[PDB]
Design a protein around this ligand. Structure first.
Ligand SMILES: COc1cc(O)c2c(c1)/C=C/C[C@H](O)[C@H](O)C(=O)/C=C\C[C@H](C)OC2=O
Length: 335
């Protein structure tokens, strides 16, 4: 029983020597030496069960990750749990041990004009898969962007995944907190775009303290939304809500990211489009001139086959979910 700061971590004897590398109200992330593979690793503990949405995602990121396989996605190496359901009050997913994440790097480092480019390639490259897979990450953000020794990048966390058809804050598309309930591929582009700007400026472009403040920060640069040839962004109480909202001029991109690559900005523009319906797609984004020396179609794998299981949103009550999580996490259970 190795207790790291907070609480316990029943992972040994395969995973001993613990430390700590990341926080989070839903689970503590520790690094630990694995006596079987002879290399340290990342062990994420999760204590869901109290509530459902929680166990709903717990057994969903598992489903995703266990069935995915991309170099720009950090997979599940193995899972540790108790031997009896009635005794299972926490799951530990073992993952690779990355060097650092994109939120920390920008917190100090100054990505070169190329480094920015290479990272952004990798991101979209992994994105051009979770999508081929027809799955929305919904929560892209620096923190969920792992990095290791040889500058490898990995997208982390898939609890909000959920097929195409509480959280981050600054990289959520406008409509998420506005129009149709997210659910759509463009939600991620917007997020990947928001990360792009931060690598250019090492500071979040739309750091609005709260929804409202958020929308303002945004309108701050894109200036008042259009009311010409609209479609799924119109609105009623909102539009007039703008009747209280003066009009703001779009701030060209040169005036924010002045010393930024002419193309890096063009791409940042196709991504930060208010209307999701006129927001550049993932494949068309890699294509884009900026991401040139990297765009390699015969080296950018796409999901094996789409999803659409049976558990979705609502329905299955914890008890029912717990068993599944349990039986699902059985093949990893020794013996
Ligand atoms: C040394 O610094 C680190 C090296 C790593 O390899 C990880 C982390 C930190 C942890 C960061 C926590 C997250 O950013 C956030 O909660 C998340 O992304 C969820 C999955 C996290 C996964 C277990 O994390 C790592 O492997």
């Amino acid at each position: 029983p190795e207790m790291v700061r907070g609480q316990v971590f029943d992972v040994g004897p395969r995973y001993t020597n613990l430390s700590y590398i990341g926080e989070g109200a839903y689970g503590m992330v520790c690094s630990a030496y694995d006596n079987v593979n002879k290399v340290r690793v990342a062990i994420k503990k999760i204590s869901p069960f109290e509530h459902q949405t929680y166990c709903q995602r717990t057994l969903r990121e598992i489903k995703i990750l266990l069935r995915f396989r991309h170099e720009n996605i950090i997979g599940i190496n193995d899972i540790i749990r108790a031997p009896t359901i009635e005794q299972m009050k926490d799951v530990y997913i073992v993952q690779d041990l990355m060097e650092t994440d994109l939120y920390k790097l920008l917190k100090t480092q100054h990505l070169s004009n190329d480094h920015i480019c290479y990272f952004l390639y990798q991101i979209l490259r992994g994105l051009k898969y979770i999508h081929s897979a027809n799955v929305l990450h919904r929560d892209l953000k620096p923190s969920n962007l792992l990095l290791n020794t040889t500058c490898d990048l990995k997208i982390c966390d898939f609890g909000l995944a959920r097929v195409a058809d509480v959280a981050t804050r600054w990289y959520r598309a406008p409509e998420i907190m506005l129009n149709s309930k997210g659910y759509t591929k463009s939600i991620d582009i917007w997020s990947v775009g928001c990360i792009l700007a931060e690598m250019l400026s090492n500071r979040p472009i739309f750091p609005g303290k709260h929804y409202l403040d958020q929308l303002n920060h945004i309108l701050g640069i894109l200036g008042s939304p259009s009311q010409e040839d609209l479609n799924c962004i119109i609105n009623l109480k909102a539009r007039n809500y703008l009747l209280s909202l003066p009009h703001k001029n779009k701030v060209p991109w040169n005036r924010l990211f002045p010393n930024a690559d002419s193309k890096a900005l063009d791409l940042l523009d196709k991504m930060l489009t208010f209307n999701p319906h006129k927001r550049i797609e993932v494949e068309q984004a890699l294509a884009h001139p900026y991401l040139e020396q990297y765009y390699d179609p015969s080296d950018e794998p796409i999901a094996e086959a789409p999803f659409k299981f049976d558990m979705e949103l609502d329905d299955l009550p914890k008890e029912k979910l717990k068993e599944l999580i349990f039986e699902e996490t059985a093949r990893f259970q020794p013996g």
